[PDB]
Subunit: 279 residues, 4 copies
């Protein structure tokens, strides 16, 4: 009979090249370990949900203001009503009798470039503007020259003495608690200009979270500024939006399931079929 | 140094209990093998797309009428307009700038019990009615007694001298080509009672495909009638709907992407928010 | 808008930015007492004051200070101090104006003889810039067009110093000729490098040492700040020398820049019984002229204005300022408030009326006391419903309110109120039946208005052929043509829009003020465009003159800037002119008539449409040349277009003060070019003590109306009988037999829009999509009933907004903290587990965050991640049916089911799970009552006696502690608490917790840069059939 | 009372700007209409599943050879064994007790750029090479110069007198039935050039389907080249792969559900955790 592989490996006479290299959890052994931090060390060292996003995503002890700011970003992103595209898809999937996972999932797949992509795009735009020299008056004019809108700037109603008021809370926190905010100050000059163009072009919350998150990564400790670009270039700022808005999508699922609403069918006079006359 | 595993196995001194038991493809070796049938044997033995659904799902040579009928079922299921729930989700996800896979996927997750579930439910209902004795007049009355609608019966407009006309094509094919159709004849004695109740309660295509598919499995060769209940009990009839309607969902994605339509946002006066006054 | 600046600021900008070979002495040698600073900081920071002799002037926009003597010349400090005492901070007057004599400039006195003061003045005219010089300086410069040398220089032209020496410096002293030849060229390059409208150096002391500037008057184009805000910096436009503002006027002055809107108030007399509340900027002039014309000139109170359709609260605030101010002192003849106005183009009249009537009902007490009488006239979209509801509040609170519609004359109400009348290669055709237009900008409302006008006037094709919007790719916008839907191609560049529609000859440039210039020039590079209509307001006058020069070079007709557009009924309508189709159908603008008007303000074209509609046949063509001081086409360019046109039979001209323009009309009748009857009336006859600018005695409405009266143009005395005289001359031309009235055909009718009807409430449409967890509309996000600032102010965690968004309740502090902990322990459990495996596979095939997280979350079902809901349901069903734990374990044993939520693999007893232990500790110290946890712990105390590794999992203790939380704390009623378990709120806890770990696994696999995974063939064991 | 919107709209005094412009199905009316073609006209005019992909995706009557070729492409793409990434995800999701839709969906989301992206990439690469002049010897050298592999070329075992043998069937069909095959001949010349370098760099089926599909679109009738570049630029060739491989993924779901296989958990000695020692 051949030797058993678990018994052969035990005495260690064999290699096997293990795939699936991972570095954010150690579910074996005595107790659960997140980064190098056991779960009891997570709980008795005071660190919040933002603390375990620091441990699981960025693999670092973030300081307490950064953990509370990550918590703030997940709070403000949580829901923006059911009219928007992803929550619409969750309501349709929940209303057709599906699960929590399928309804959440069918809503989450909408989150892309047009919906929910203003976080990562508004971070990348302003970061590439700020670390390549450009003064804000040249940056606004340059995005006017090639005809692209500035992502993270523009709100449909809220202009002047009428702030977004979840931008106001995040801006107050970032002024009060962060040590240094360079890219925020550039995002507020290049917005102190764009409001003078037309008054309702304030910073979005989708732009404020992006610039303050890039500012948080490259301004606090434990990020080397060339890793702090790695997480933004990967798409860690999409993760903030998706984890934040999963809260509201599951809320929409539970709400549509609790109201006992039947299957949706879109009305025929909101379609305008333009089929070819004979193909 | 330890011995290399692939080299320890090659000359065969070791076991390893292989998981992932599979039986529908052999991608290794000389050429691709679907069931026991190489791909050249698939192509030069005349067998259609329904032939390779027979090979990949049910793992059998289905006869040519059954392969053509599977092709017919995939043809009629292909699209039913954009107003329906799943194609709505595909249009929303495609219109928010996502991929083909994410738009198709966000539409496919709607396919459940209320949308797209009439195939498997209408098959299971009529099969459990027919193999448990019950005469059609007692079956209609019995589903009246416990207050459940008969799945696969009922169409919103099409009643009498106004057939579904894709039910008509499938019914003509099943009469002309199938050897024996017991459960179809029971499903038509039940539609010929229920149309006499109210005339627009004809067989759906969602009920005709289910009863003719159960009839195809347990009536043609190579199915033993505990295998032929196994595939219906698993949900192979959901697979017919999902593979059929993936065609129309990808068509809706390509159509919405070709028309260059911007991000959707549902209008606020089609919502009627009923939030609590103070929580 | 040419706004004057103080001579300190003009001196400062001159000393900063001048570029000449001359040495400008006394550079930054100026101080400014600002009769209210101290007398020591100014004498130390500018320590040159003790070094020379001095001079003091007032820099408060005072004109001709050398005649009446507000100047203090050639003294020392204390003589000047004494002067400043009987000056620095009390009343003084010049001409007519009286006021506090505030700001004084102080200059070091230059020793000058009378042979060295010179005179230079550069002012902007329409055809260029005029530089003007006189070498016999001082105040006695004499006449300015005869002896003082003028020199026009064109626009986008360079003034050569050879030109200054040869044309302008002829009678200069020969010793001081080349220093001035440098100075004038440097001063002109300063002049047009900044955007000055008017610069005045009088006098100009040029000695052997160099050049000394002493007094300047500068008016700068204040709308050009977007070019020169870095160059002016902190520019200050002082108000002209007058009285002090009231404590209501400053309230409206900072109510001005509160929303984008025009809110103006200037009081003529605060004891005046006649008060105006008039919408529309031209109507505030016309109403004031009609009141002043009818004996109310000393009893008119102000010249109020509201425009831009401000908010209900904002119009409430302006209305409370205007109604409060007339209750200060009464008058035995009674007091009148006049809610005037022209037709509003698109604004719902009813809502602004709701604001005004809420203000009236808010101040109803003193209004009944003081005997105010309100005369109201308004028109527009839904003007009727507003008029009825304001008659309703006039019946409610007892104040006499007389409401009037579009049928009555707009200024008939002020004669009814006083009681004088009783109370009851440029082309001669621009638009045709077949002209297409290209709209520059995403202006779907204006384009839809144009298509609606084209459908109602029985026109065969839409006149919007394409749209150009440079901020998005080419697509098709979906518009309405009648009741069916058509597609209008939206382009990105201009060139492809011109190539794909080569027969377009009209462009409507809806660009903003700072990008209208280059967009219009880029348009003018294409020669198929014959007319451009510039809608933007606030384009600087230098760019407007450059556009005018290239239009006269290329033969293109510019209508604008600051216009609403023009309308040719039956043919074409430029954007927003006329209003929506209520005003088009009401003024009968779907068919052509025989009367053509030219108006200057865009807001008065609607009232001219009314007067022509109700008195005569109808409008044939009406263009608004715009509000700018340099219109692209003047009056004289359009009356010649109409006189050449055979379709018209009479021409109406509505002029204002400013620009010698109606004297060209006088010359046109004088030499007989204009033979068709012209009725004209220049509004702005408020002389009883851009637009309006550089006015002489001949530039006033009285002198202009006198000149056109004597020249043969029919002129009415006031605006009231403009309708009467236009009907009189219409009867003249139908009695003579040249005007024939064609028969009225009914027009094609359009459906009313859904938004309009829905907003004006006549249609109810059943709304699907009931929701209760977010209110995105309104001012603030509302989660359950909480605004988002109430969420952050109360410091309620992520568990708090899970309570708000999922359960719609305020959970207590321990429950929010517990939900945070049970998300935290659920966060990730390694990559070997099934869902994290799927996320690693999908992330490792190069997918996004959403696709990888999604492909992992879809594993979360009944076997993986289903222990939460199933363990909570099983223990809830065991506890609620009153089964003791010893019987519950056996009843699971007899049914052949494992107790879900109990059983761990390695860690058992005195080796616990250690995150079960944390949650169990928290639930013991913080929960008020724990029945279900106690039941689950006794079931654990049995099944660990069975086998020691059968403890409560975290997947079972989160379930029983969550059901324990739901049915054991407050705010849940045990039929809501059981419902949320059956819906699957415990699946949501697991999915939201594990999403953190799955996104972490995605980021970890993406950051390690690991490539595509193919599962090894040695781990498969294919069991294919033999030969199917 | 206000007027009812359906009654208001009916007699037509009102507009409402209908969103959701669509052009591939007309589920209202007498009978189902795919492009301009009713469903009876689909069935009695002989046209296959490839015919209704022609109607639903490209909105045209494709000729019978093109419909049969689309059917061929869906046949060969159907499965390539369970070891590959997407079928692996379907087996994991099916083995954890999920639905057909969730298992299919969790497998389909793998289909991206590294798995299943060789179709669209191999089409775009060769099309941009062929319509920009470049001779094949310069094209191979140019993709050597900038260090990119040629997508759709390279097979792990099958080299010379050992063809892919589903490439052979498609190549035989394209030679026999297509009218003109320019881009295939350029892909064939290039294939030959690459093979002479190292013999196992033949055309993949993932490259042959891409070049023959671009050839089919721009070579048969009813496609103007600009609008035939539209469908390739959108990603219609991803749709062929996804609709083809959905067959095998549903087969893998039904197979894993029929074998009654329990929950999968990856072995711990195939992971190699590299967690930080203390974070
Ligand atoms: C009573 C009566 O009606 S009669 C009085 C008649 N008088 C008039 O004509 C006044 C009419 N005025 C107007 O209506 C306006 O000036 C209009 C119609 C020209 C529209 O102008 P606006 O609305 O300011 O232009 P727009 O909407 O394009 O916004 C302007 C700027 O926003 C900028 N912008 C917008 N969004 C963004 C963004 N997201 N990021 C960056 N920049 C942005 C645009 O780029 C544009 O900048 P630019 O000025 O460099 O082009
Ligand atoms: O997050 C986004 O980009 C979209 C959204 O919710 C909003 O409309 O504010
Ligand atoms: O065919 C289906 O099952 C879905 C559908 O069209 C309908 O609900 O009308
Ligand atoms: O849009 C316009 O030009 C007119 C308008 O809305 C208003 O009167 O407020
Ligand atoms: O919650 C589950 O069912 C799966 C899990 O985390 C475990 O492996 O313990
Ligand atoms: O298509 C792919 O990229 C993967 C594939 O079929 C295989 O290698 O088995």
């Amino acid at each position: 009979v051949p030797m058993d592989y678990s018994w052969a490996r035990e005495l260690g006479l064999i290699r096997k090249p293990a795939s699936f290299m991972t570095s954010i959890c150690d579910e074996r052994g005595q107790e659960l370990i997140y980064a190098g931090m056991p779960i009891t060390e997570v709980f008795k060292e005071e660190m919040g949900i933002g603390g375990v996003l620091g441990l699981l995503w960025f693999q670092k002890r973030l300081p307490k203001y950064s953990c509370q700011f990550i918590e703030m970003c997940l709070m403000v992103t949580a829901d923006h009503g059911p009219a928007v595209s992803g929550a619409h898809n969750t309501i349709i999937c929940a209303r057709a009798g599906k699960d929590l996972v399928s309804s959440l999932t069918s809503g989450l797949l909408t989150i892309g470039d047009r919906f929910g992509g203003a976080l990562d795009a508004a971070a990348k735009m302003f970061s590439k503007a700020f670390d390549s020299g450009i003064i804000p008056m040249e940056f606004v004019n340059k995005m006017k020259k090639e005809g692209k809108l500035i992502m993270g700037i523009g709100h449909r109603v809220k202009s002047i003495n009428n702030p977004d008021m979840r931008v106001q809370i995040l801006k107050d926190y970032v002024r009060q608690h962060f040590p240094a905010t360079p890219l925020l100050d550039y995002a507020l000059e290049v917005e102190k200009i764009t409001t003078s163009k037309k008054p309702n072009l304030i910073l979005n919350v989708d732009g404020l979270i992006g610039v303050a998150f890039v500012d948080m990564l490259r301004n606090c400790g434990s990020f080397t500024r060339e890793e702090a670009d790695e997480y933004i270039d990967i798409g860690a700022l999409n993760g903030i939006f998706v984890l934040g808005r999963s809260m509201g999508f599951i809320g929409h699922y539970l709400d549509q399931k609790r109201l006992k609403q039947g299957l949706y069918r879109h009305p025929w006079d909101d379609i305008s079929y333009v089929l070819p006359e004979h193909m």
